[PDB]
Design a binder for these strands. Structure first.
Ligand SMILES: COc1ccc(C[C@H]2NC[C@H](O)[C@H]2OC(C)=O)cc1
Ligand SMILES: [K+]
Ligand SMILES: [Mg+2]
Ligand SMILES: [Mg+2]
Ligand SMILES: [Mg+2]
Ligand SMILES: [Mg+2]
Ligand SMILES: [Mg+2]
Ligand SMILES: [Mg+2]
Ligand SMILES: [Mg+2]
Ligand SMILES: [Mg+2]
Ligand SMILES: [Mg+2]
Ligand SMILES: [Mg+2]
Ligand SMILES: [Mg+2]
Ligand SMILES: [Mg+2]
Ligand SMILES: [Mg+2]
Ligand SMILES: [Mg+2]
Ligand SMILES: [Mg+2]
Ligand SMILES: [Mg+2]
Ligand SMILES: [Mg+2]
Ligand SMILES: [Mg+2]
Ligand SMILES: [Mg+2]
Ligand SMILES: [Mg+2]
Ligand SMILES: [Mg+2]
Ligand SMILES: [Mg+2]
Ligand SMILES: [Mg+2]
Ligand SMILES: [Mg+2]
Ligand SMILES: [Mg+2]
Ligand SMILES: [Mg+2]
Ligand SMILES: [Mg+2]
Ligand SMILES: [Mg+2]
Ligand SMILES: [Mg+2]
Ligand SMILES: [Mg+2]
Ligand SMILES: [Mg+2]
Ligand SMILES: [Mg+2]
Ligand SMILES: [Mg+2]
Lengths: 136, 201, 190, 176
RNA sequence: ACCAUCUGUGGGAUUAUGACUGAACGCCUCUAAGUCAGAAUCCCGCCCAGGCGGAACGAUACGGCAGCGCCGCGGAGCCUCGGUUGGCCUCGGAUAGCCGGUCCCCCGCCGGGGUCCGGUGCGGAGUGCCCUUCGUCCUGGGAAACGGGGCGCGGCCGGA
RNA sequence: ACGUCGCUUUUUGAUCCUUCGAUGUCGGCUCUUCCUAUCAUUGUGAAGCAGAAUUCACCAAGCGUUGGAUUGUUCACCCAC
RNA sequence: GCGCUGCGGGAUGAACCGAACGCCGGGUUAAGGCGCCCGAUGCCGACGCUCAUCAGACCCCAGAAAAGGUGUUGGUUGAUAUAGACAGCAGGACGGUGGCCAUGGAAGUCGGAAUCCGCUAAGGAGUGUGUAACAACUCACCUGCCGAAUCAACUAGCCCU
RNA sequence: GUUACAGCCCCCCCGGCAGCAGCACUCGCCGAAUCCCGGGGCCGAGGGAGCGAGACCCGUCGCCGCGCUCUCCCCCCUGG
């Protein structure tokens, strides 16, 4: 039933802590609680990091365990995780949250005017589909 | 936040939920707890049944009519748990206690309202999967609660009505997704504004 | 400690179909269908292979106790595979010193009436578990044949009969009277 | 001693004060795991007073410097030899830990002794700490991580942000 | 007045214990997960009382021009208690999993099941959604014209 | 058995903290409730348990535990059920 | 130190822990705490240990021992093992000799001492059942099938009796 | 089995070059080797400080740190 496994090369998204919001690659497993992570292209140096702050992604890199950061960086750039991650809905949901928290007072006014109008265009078309289905 | 906080009791731990509820009613915040029969208690059933039977043994010897009142209904058991967590011998505590309503099953008008959960008291969150737990409904039924079968019959009726309401919502939502695709050209520019500020993905 | 991984795999005969609905195991065979629910055990069940099927039970990070259920589930599944292919046949023998134990089967193997146990005028009405058929052996006297697909139902039905014929207030080392399970086997022989 | 926070490996060098009998007393080097250097020096005098007839009054801390990990980025299996006082008698144990550092493994040992044996820090004497090869590891709890291709999921992830929000209409998911 | 006479009761979960299936521990094992039988005990029923606890139903003040009820969100003014400063109109629930959408079979324009397709750090998202307040005038495009607003009217259906 | 670890406050001691501008003393009688370290009765396990009887142990205090001679008696002892 | 002394904590309390006191504001602490009563963890606290059908839960302090557990978790000392262990399923378990004394009986198996040798894969001066003594079964020991770890004793944490 | 179609470790080279308790949040003690700026809270006790003269509406006073003029040029901007 499981689909995402902790393994050498698995790319994880850091949820909280000093490196919150960054991707890392699992280089080695220390024990049941900690793993040796290394984000060379994401500005996270090699260090121990608990599994409690890691969210597994659907990305696996191919490098042997405890390899030097050079080989982790080569595999990271070879698969080009940075652009692939940005194309995912996971990252898009993240950036949407940043934009929403970044809305100025003027932006909130502009979004509301758009909501007063778009939801209203959708409402009429819903009512039309109500009536069309009723006759049919 | 809401004026009246309606909490589904199912899947929640009795003491954890009582602590959260007791604080809220002390801070104003009228609270309504429903499905008190669905409340869980940590530890195997027989241990918890022993605990409540030991509660039944506590009666004033000279006059049990004045002694502790053992309430059998899951609602009243939870209500008594909350009262233990309040200064109920002061006007402040009594006023706080009046702000709490407890119900077995979901009576009208709360059956047609959105019910909120408390993840800090949810059994799936607070208990390891290998620990035994007890259902307040079964525990109450075995200490003298008479209406386990009636509540179960009325809850099944309510669940039948709520599915018809949900099928209607899924039909309405399928139509609203259809509506957006039809008028996408007329709402394109408004969609971009929402996408620009993260209101849509 | 907590072991990282512990798995046991059970084979599946070509004539048996197993489907999984989460931790619910549905086993279908020539003799019928058996369903078991394993929601009380936190394990991962997977089906492997296409030409020949294979069920695997996975347990990650379990303690000594959680580790023990891995073989328990596998044994239960193998019993279900046995039930739908060959079935279960629990043979009971009636032992009596003086008073013969008279067993009459009613409601097509669903009710077993036991008479003259120890000379008592009390008739024992023992109701078989659903899906379990009791019959009186024709080859050999004083023998009952319990047949069913679920080892647990067939064996519990035999247990109900065995504890029905219980000697009380007497030295049970003597007074070895009752109906006892003598043989555990299968309706079909492989 | 109180095993406060994470421990630090201190190299403490000491000697007796020069006397007319001995103008050049020998120097003694000890590895001390203490929260700070003040505790490290105090533990040094406790140990050399038991091994030699050397006290703080007649002795001298020649050097006390922290020993940094020489491979903090490499996971290592550490074997620790220790003796501690239980409620009835004294026992020598050998324990294995995996850690990025020698001092973090020693700190794990103090937590483990506190957990599995209710052993306070003051009752524990660490004798020998050294990195051991994987083939020389004895404890199955450590040996199971010696897999070139180790794979495991994270099942039943429990919600930790249980009060943000405190009330919600969504029941939390544990399968991620 | 046992100094006459009549009447005194049914369930449930279970204890001890005995077991089933079954690992731990290739065997074994009543136990670890799961399951069964089980008693003057326990809990309830029967029975006694009936909450600063409810329910349903009846009748509701006349020769005085009186008392009252209901409507007309009828007209004001009075005394008195104050809190609050948008709404959410709802699947069931799972958690070693879940959610949504379709092409076929059977329950009878339903619903269920089997495929298939998507989503899943939940975006068909409560970290959410809805609504929105300065008013008006002139005036042009959009959107709408299947339109809004009226204890305006009457009727019907659903909800115990 | 030799040893040895405990529990109870149903005996007696030890102590003298409370009460000497006063807490009515023994026993019975009457009456209620409670404890279990269970005599009986319900369910059971064990025996040097064939049956009957008996003994040991478990769940268990729901229910019951009487009529008299002598004695102020508590306590004893006997008669009888 | 109390008495002669309030105050914070220990629910409560003459003596404990902190601290001793004019009437106040702000700041900070001690001992002690921060689920709710009840100020403060509403930290995405760290690492384990523990399931109790009498769990446990904070100086004084307000309940328990010897003894035991194949519960579980560590740790110590040994032993066997890919020349095949452990478990399970099967065969052998021999001759001197019925070793000596003693005993009515004592032939491995009532008792006390000796406890050795051709014969192999092994077989003992026998781990038990058994006989008046025998016999017989059986055990260690060893072999066939099997194919990775396993066995024994002890120790101390929580829990249980 | 020992680099191959991956890598790991150790020893030799002033091993080099950035950088340096990193601004890649891996792991410290510090400031005569330390300065600047900002925000919240609570407060405003006192009341003849005058060596100056004959103090006259009036103690803008003491200590401390500064700036301009009684020297003269030059530059920039809108006499300052
Ligand atoms: C030897 O038996 C007795 C001795 C003395 C007392 C009386 C005392 N008991 C408690 C009081 O101090 C006093 O009561 C009164 C009212 O004086 C009773 C029995
Ligand atoms: K007196
Ligand atoms: Mg009662
Ligand atoms: Mg009652
Ligand atoms: Mg008998
Ligand atoms: Mg029998
Ligand atoms: Mg260890
Ligand atoms: Mg909230
Ligand atoms: Mg009468
Ligand atoms: Mg029953
Ligand atoms: Mg069995
Ligand atoms: Mg049992
Ligand atoms: Mg039962
Ligand atoms: Mg107002
Ligand atoms: Mg004795
Ligand atoms: Mg006295
Ligand atoms: Mg008096
Ligand atoms: Mg008096
Ligand atoms: Mg009196
Ligand atoms: Mg008398
Ligand atoms: Mg007892
Ligand atoms: Mg009684
Ligand atoms: Mg007399
Ligand atoms: Mg005095
Ligand atoms: Mg004094
Ligand atoms: Mg004092
Ligand atoms: Mg105090
Ligand atoms: Mg106290
Ligand atoms: Mg203050
Ligand atoms: Mg403190
Ligand atoms: Mg407190
Ligand atoms: Mg608080
Ligand atoms: Mg132990
Ligand atoms: Mg105990
Ligand atoms: Mg002033």
């Amino acid at each position: 039933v499981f689909r995402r496994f902790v393994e050498v090369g698995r790319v994880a998204y850091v949820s909280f802590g000093p490196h919150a919001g960054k991707l890392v690659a699992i280089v080695d497993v220390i024990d049941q609680n900690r793993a040796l992570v290394d984000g060379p292209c994401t500005q996270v140096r090699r260090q121990a990091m608990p599994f409690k702050c890691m969210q597994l992604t659907d990305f696996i890199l191919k490098f042997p365990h405890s390899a030097h950061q050079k080989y982790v960086r080569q595999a990271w750039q070879k698969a080009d995780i940075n652009t692939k991650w940005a194309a995912t809905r996971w990252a898009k949901k993240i950036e949407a949250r940043e934009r929403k928290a970044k809305m100025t007072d003027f932006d909130r006014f502009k979004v509301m005017k758009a909501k007063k109008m778009r939801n209203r265009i959708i409402k009429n078309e819903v009512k039309k589909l109500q009536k069309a289905a009723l006759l049919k | 936040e809401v004026q009246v906080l309606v909490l589904d009791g199912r899947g929640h731990l009795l003491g954890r939920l009582a602590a959260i509820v007791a604080k809220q009613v002390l801070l104003g915040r009228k609270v309504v707890v429903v499905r008190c029969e669905g409340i869980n208690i940590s530890g195997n059933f027989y241990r918890n049944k022993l605990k409540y039977l030991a509660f039944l043994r506590k009666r004033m010897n000279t006059n049990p009519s004045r002694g502790p009142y053992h309430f059998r209904a899951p609602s009243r058991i939870f209500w008594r748990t909350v009262r233990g967590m309040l200064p109920h011998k002061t006007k402040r505590g009594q006023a706080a206690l009046d702000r709490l309503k407890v119900f077995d099953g979901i009576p009208p008008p709360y059956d047609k309202k959105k019910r909120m959960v408390v993840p800090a008291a949810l059994k799936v969150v607070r208990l390891k999967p290998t620990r035994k737990f007890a259902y307040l409904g079964r525990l109450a039924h075995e200490v003298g609660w008479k209406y386990q079968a009636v509540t179960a019959t009325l809850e099944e009726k309510r669940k039948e009505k709520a599915k018809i309401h949900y099928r209607k919502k899924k039909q309405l939502m399928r139509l609203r997704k259809q509506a957006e695709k039809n008028v996408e050209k007329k709402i394109d520019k408004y969609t971009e504004v929402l996408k620009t500020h993260g209101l849509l993905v | 400690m907590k072991t990282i991984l512990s798995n046991q795999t059970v084979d599946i005969p070509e004539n048996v179909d197993i489907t999984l609905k989460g931790r619910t195991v549905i086993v279908k065979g020539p003799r019928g269908t058996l369903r078991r629910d394993f929601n009380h055990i936190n394990v991962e069940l997977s089906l492997l292979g296409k030409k020949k099927k294979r069920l695997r039970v996975d347990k990650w990070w379990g303690n000594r106790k959680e580790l023990a259920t891995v073989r328990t589930i596998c044994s239960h599944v193998q019993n279900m595979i046995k039930g739908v292919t060959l079935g279960f046949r629990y043979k009971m023998r009636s032992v009596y010193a003086h008073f013969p134990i008279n067993v009459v089967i009613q409601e097509n193997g669903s009710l077993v009436e036991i008479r003259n146990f120890l000379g008592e005028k009390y008739i024992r009405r023992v109701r078989m578990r659903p899906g379990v058929a009791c019959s009186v052996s024709q080859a050999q006297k004083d023998e009952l044949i319990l047949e069913g697909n679920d080892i647990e139902l067939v064996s519990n039905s035999a247990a109900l009969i065995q504890q029905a014929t219980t000697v009380k207030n007497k030295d049970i080392r003597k007074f070895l009277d009752g109906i006892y399970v003598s043989e555990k086997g299968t309706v079909q022989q492989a | 001693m109180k095993a406060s926070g994470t421990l630090r490996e201190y190299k403490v060098v000491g000697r007796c004060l020069p006397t007319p009998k001995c103008h050049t007393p020998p120097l003694y080097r000890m590895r001390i795991f203490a929260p700070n250097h003040v505790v490290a020096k105090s533990r040094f005098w406790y140990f050399v007073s038991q091994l030699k007839k050397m006290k703080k009054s007649s002795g001298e801390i020649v050097y006390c410097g922290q020993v940094f990990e020489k491979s903090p980025l490499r996971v290592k299996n550490f074997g620790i030899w220790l003796r501690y006082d239980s409620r009835s008698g004294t026992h020598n144990m050998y324990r294995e830990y995996r850690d990025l550092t020698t001092a973090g493994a020693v700190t794990q040992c103090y937590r483990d002794m506190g957990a599995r044996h209710r052993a306070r820090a003051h009752s524990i004497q660490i004798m020998k700490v050294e990195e051991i090869a994987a083939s020389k590891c004895r404890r199955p709890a450590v040996k199971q991580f010696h897999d070139s291709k180790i794979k495991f999921p994270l099942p039943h992830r429990v919600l930790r942000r249980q009060h943000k929000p405190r009330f919600t209409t969504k029941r939390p998911n544990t399968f991620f």
